[PDB]
Paper text:
A HEPN (higher eukaryote and prokaryote nucleotide binding) nuclease Las1 and a polynucleotide kinase Grc3 assemble into a tetramerase responsible for rRNA maturation. Las1 and Grc3 are highly conserved proteins and have recently been identified as core enzymes involved in processing and removing ITS2 spacer, which is a key step in the synthesis of 60S ribosomal subunit. Recent studies have demonstrated that Las1 is an endoribonuclease that contains a HEPN (higher eukaryote and prokaryote nucleotide binding) domain responsible for rRNA processing. Grc3 is a polynucleotide kinase responsible not only for Las1 nuclease activation, but also for nonspecific phosphorylation of the 5′-OH of the 26S pre-rRNA produced by Las1 cleavage, providing a signal for further processing by Rat1-Rai1 exonuclease.
After screening a large number of crystallization conditions, we successfully obtained well-ordered crystals of the CjLas1 HEPN domain and determined its structure at 1.80 Å resolution using molecular replacement method. The crystallographic asymmetric unit contained three Las1 HEPN molecules (HEPN1, HEPN2, and HEPN3), each of which assumes an all α-helical fold. Analysis of crystal packing and interactions across HEPN-HEPN interfaces suggests that the biological unit of Las1 HEPN domain may contain a homodimer and a monomer. HEPN1 and HEPN2 molecules form a face-to-face dimer related through the preudo-twofold axis, similar to the HEPN dimer in the Las1-Grc3 tetramer structure. Secondly, the catalytic residues in HEPN1 and HEPN2 domains are close to each other to form a compact active center, whereas the catalytic residues in HEPN3 and its symmetry-related molecule remain far apart, presenting two separate catalytic sites. We compared the HEPN domain dimer structures in CjLas1 and CjLas1-Grc3 complex by superposition and observed that significant conformational changes occur in HEPN domains upon Grc3 binding. Remarkably, large conformational changes are observed in the catalytic pocket. In the Grc3-free Las1 structure, the catalytic residues Arg129, His130, and His134 within one HEPN domain are far from the catalytic residues in the other HEPN domain, while in the Grc3-bound structure, the catalytic residues within two HEPN domains are close to each other. These observations indicate that the Grc3 binding not only stabilizes the Las1 HEPN dimer, but also promotes the formation of a more compact catalytic pocket, showing better catalytic activity for specific cleavage of ITS2.
Author numbering:
A (entry chain A): 10 to 165
B (entry chain B): 12 to 101, 111 to 163
């Protein structure tokens, strides 16, 4: 997958080389285009989960960066759902299995920071994570998909 | 029973709901949600109060959707339903029957959690039905 012209094109929308230069309108329009495109590639493959996670992470990022004040609940609910689904699509296959292992060991295994496991537990069972906890965890998850997927996307 | 809960019931579920504007209705919802947020900071607040606040937050976002990408309203609504169900329930289907929680909520929680994100229409149906449920089983008996 990491070589296809389709994912290489998506990488340039989600992670423009251009980025500091580009206007935020243009930036968001490129993000939005990539999100629409992802709906097009929908497999039960690890890559598909990364693409869909990336789409919703940037959906949450724009909502977080656009927050102008007032009630913060909808943006925290949006970001929290995104993080849960991101973690779950990476961890569910083992955790939902007949031979599940402790999530901390399972996260250590795919190099997923424990903060994401803790975030998921809070958003699932406890107080909804705060605005800044959501912003930090959406930022770090974008870092993660980049480190573990997008960085390696290139034409051969 | 408490004055605060009696006041909140009139903001979430006003009498004049038939004859009131979206703006007026939504300003009262936001007042109620900010009040809950305020109670929750200081003191212990019930799950039904917290979920009612987020449910109306999700409802407003759903009704205000006007086109374009629907992902954020669906993510918002899905997280609200998951927490609503989790606070009530944590064999889920069996537990839900015991408390008269429709099975559709367990199925929604599962999809949002583990599979495809539910559709805009599934989100609206669920939020509507969850607001009906907290009325039937909590708010209706406050007076």
């Amino acid at each position: 997958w990491k070589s296809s012209d389709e994912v290489v094109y998506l990488k340039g929308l989600f992670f423009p080389a251009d980025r500091e230069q580009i206007s935020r309108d243009e930036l968001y329009r490129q993000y939005e285009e990539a999100i629409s495109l992802v709906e097009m590639y929908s497999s039960r493959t690890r890559v598909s989960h990364i693409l869909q996670s990336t789409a919703h992470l940037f959906s949450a990022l724009m909502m977080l960066e656009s927050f102008e004040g007032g009630l913060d609940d909808t943006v925290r609910l949006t970001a929290s759902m995104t993080i849960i689904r991101f973690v779950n699509g990476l961890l569910d296959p083992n955790q939902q299995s007949q031979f599940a292992i402790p999530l901390h060991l399972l996260a250590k295994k795919i190099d997923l920071p424990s903060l994401f496991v803790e975030f998921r537990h809070s958003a699932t069972h406890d107080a909804l994570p705060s605005l800044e906890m959501c912003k930090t965890c959406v930022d770090r998850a974008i870092d993660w998909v980049w480190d573990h997927y997008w960085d390696g996307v290139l034409s051969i």
